[model samples]
Target: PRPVLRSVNSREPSQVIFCNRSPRVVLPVWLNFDGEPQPYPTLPPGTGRRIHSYRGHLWLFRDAGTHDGLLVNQTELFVPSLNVDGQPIFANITLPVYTLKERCLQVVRSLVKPENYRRLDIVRSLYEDLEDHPNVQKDLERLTQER
Candidate 1:
């Protein structure tokens, strides 16, 4: 299942008709799915290794059998594969964190486009929720100004 929301679903606020979709964006994601959870290992001797990072999680060791059957998004075991230590067998995974737009826009768009979707005004409500968190407010304020 692709999480990408193409532009084909976008429309104006009036007389809106949509493709029952939203938006998509690329982000730094992490999923932990390595080999059986064991004490971190150390490779010895001259070994050519290619490491891939799975999201912000574990690294993928390109060793035969050990992690050969791994695929993207497939959760291994119960937990996601995390990159032990900073040395993740680095696989750059892109995560979707919704469209980088103001909540107001999301609301208006949803109401007009998807008549069945419920979207209401929560701009001030969300701002109040973030009032105590300085960093969050600052970040949201900047984003809001962008709108």
Candidate 2:
């Protein structure tokens, strides 16, 4: 018989994908397993971190730049771990406030080849969609103009 609650089907950790999409926010990701909190590095915008042998849920917090410290996402618990094949078993984890521009840039960078990103229309099209936030719009505008 299994001891206490150990499972025979438990899988080993393969990888963890931590992505930060906002330039203005520093994402401090915490890992909590068996009830205690663990501290990790804060991810700057346009960056990510991955680790192996990790096997549980994670919590993501944003730096509020105040005495109150970091702000938690909608729910304190954020994302889940991967299965044996290294593919996440549940839904993806993305913070709504940071998803728009950073995600757009990531998609653009991933889909467009190096040469394609130089196309004026391609950059213009992407920029046109992110005009709601002034900083995001300005940042993208400058980035495109530089390319």
lDDT of 2 by residue, 1-147 (tens): 212211123354536555554443454544334433345565665666664434544454454231112223343334444565547443223344435666566455546555545564755666545332223222323423432
What is the C-alpha RMSD, rounded to one decimal, of candidate 2? 16.1
Model 2 CA lDDT for position 146: 38
- Deviation in angstroms for 9 in model 1? 46
TM-score of each: 0.18, 0.39
Cand. 1 Cα-lDDT: 0.27
> What local lDDT score does residue 87 receive in model 2, on the 0 to 100 scale?
70
- Backbone clashes (count) for model 1: 18
> lDDT of each structure?
0.27, 0.43
Model 1 segments beyond 4 Å from truth? 1-92, 97-122, 128-147
